[PDB]
Nucleic acid binder design. Structure first.
Ligand SMILES: [Mg+2]
Length: 67
RNA sequence: UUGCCUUUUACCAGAACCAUCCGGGUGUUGUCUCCAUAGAAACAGGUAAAGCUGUAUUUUUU
């Protein structure tokens, strides 16, 4: 259990870093700043995965406490 | 922080910080150079030349 805890923590940290980075990027993209074509694709990918995660979490929520 | 862009150098041109560099000033020492190269002149005056002053009838002195 302790290991599972620790890893859960560290991925939450990493996850936090990721999500915030993504958010920063998307504002940056909106602004129309210098940004790497590759970087923009990366951000698109991240934000998609993020969106899917959000979405299916909402599905879970819907299930877990009725319509 | 913007721009070109989009990958970095290289860059756009603004900011704030800072540094580098091309030079500069004096002052003092010292050297290098070109010229030099005297160990004593005044006083008494005269000569000539330079620095100031001078050319009584009510308050300065007639
Ligand atoms: Mg590469």
């Amino acid at each position: 259990a302790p290991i599972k805890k620790i890893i859960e923590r560290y991925i939450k940290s990493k996850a936090d870093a990721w999500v915030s980075a993504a958010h920063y990027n998307r504002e940056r993209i909106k602004r129309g700043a210098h940004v790497e074509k590759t970087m923009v694709k990366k951000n698109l990918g991240r934000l998609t995965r993020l969106w899917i995660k959000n979405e299916q979490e909402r599905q879970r929520q819907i299930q877990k406490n009725g319509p």
